[PDB]
Structure 1
Amino acid sequence: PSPEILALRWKDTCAHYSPHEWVAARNVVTANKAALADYFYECMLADPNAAFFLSDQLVKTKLHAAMQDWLESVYAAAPTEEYERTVAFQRKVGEVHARIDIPVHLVTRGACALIRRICELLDRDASLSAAQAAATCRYVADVTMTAVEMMCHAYS
């Protein structure tokens, strides 16, 4: 299952939306990427079953920054047309988790935390119309879940 094939799925998912959704989403994510990373590790480190796989040092020195870079990569893909590069990266991230047996149910819960908080931030974005915010939230759920799908290829 090659990256140029997986890139079609990413391109097709994003093509359901306009560049306006891509930009609105990428703007809220870049403006809040540290706060989104904070919320992700706040949610995970609180569950003892998730904390099992995480050290405070690993989060502080590596993963907190990596999560910000992951978010930027996901939301840069469609605007910069870097589909093949992004899907290739998602596949490798998935392989990292599968190799150390991160329970897939915690990966999906993590994805949900990011989708929820990004869509909460979009709802409060005064620069978007009701219709534009709505379309952007649908894109955020779609593109995040596409990234999660690529990551979850490693688990089969």
Structure 2
Amino acid sequence: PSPEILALRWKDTSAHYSPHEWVAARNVVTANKAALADYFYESMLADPNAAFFLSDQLVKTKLHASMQDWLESVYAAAPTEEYERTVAFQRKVGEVHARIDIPVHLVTRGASALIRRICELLDRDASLSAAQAAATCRYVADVTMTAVEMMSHAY
């Protein structure tokens, strides 16, 4: 399924939501990416299965500073109309993960932790009505699980 075909799936997903949701989310996620990357990394030390794959020094440069640009790839695609660029990024990361038999259930695990944590930021952000913080959190979960689905194409 080429990135022309898989673009339209990202687009049609993002189109369930207003521009206000797209940007709202994007702003919160760039505002706190490095902090959201730390929280991710720590979450999968806590998991021993996942900790096996982290030799406690590989993140120093790679995993912390990379998880950042993932968060930008994902949350900008829609407000930029740059879908096939983003979708392409996801297959690379999916293929990287699959090459080293990183079990897919742990990715879905991580997708879920981020979603709970990004919504927690949306919640604690006082510059929004709870109606808005709600609708953004929805978008967040949808696009994460859209991305993860595509990351999962390499199995």
Q: CA deviation at 1:80?
A: 0.8
Q: Percent identity at matched positions?
A: 97
Q: Tell me, which stretches of 5 or more residues in structure 1 are unaligned?
A: none
RMSD between superposed Cα atoms in Å? 0.7
Could you report, residue by residue, the CA deviation over 1:42-98 in whole angstroms, capped at 9, with x for unpaired residues?
110121110111122211110100001100110010011110100011011101111
> Distance between the aligned counterparts of 1:54 and 1:146, measured in 2?
25
> Distance between the aligned counterparts of 1:118 and 1:87, measured in 2?
21
**Tell me, what secondary structure is at the counterpart of 1:107?**
helix
Q: Which residue of 1 aligns with 2:116?
A: 116
> Distance between the aligned counterparts of 2:23 and 2:135, measured in 1?
12
> Distance between the aligned counterparts of 2:110 and 2:10, measured in 1?
20
Q: Which residue of 2 aligns with 1:8?
A: 8
Q: Tell me, which stretches of 5 or more residues in structure 2 are unaligned?
A: none
Could you report, residue by residue, the CA deviation over 1:112-131 in whole angstroms, capped at 9, with x for unpaired residues?
11111000000111111111
**Tell me, what secondary structure is at the counterpart of 1:56?**
coil
**Tell me, what secondary structure is at the counterpart of 2:102?**
coil
Structure 1 stretch 45-54 or stretch 64-73: which is displaced more? 45-54
TM-score, with normalisation over the residues of structure 1?
A: 0.97
> Distance between the aligned counterparts of 1:135 and 1:147, measured in 2?
19
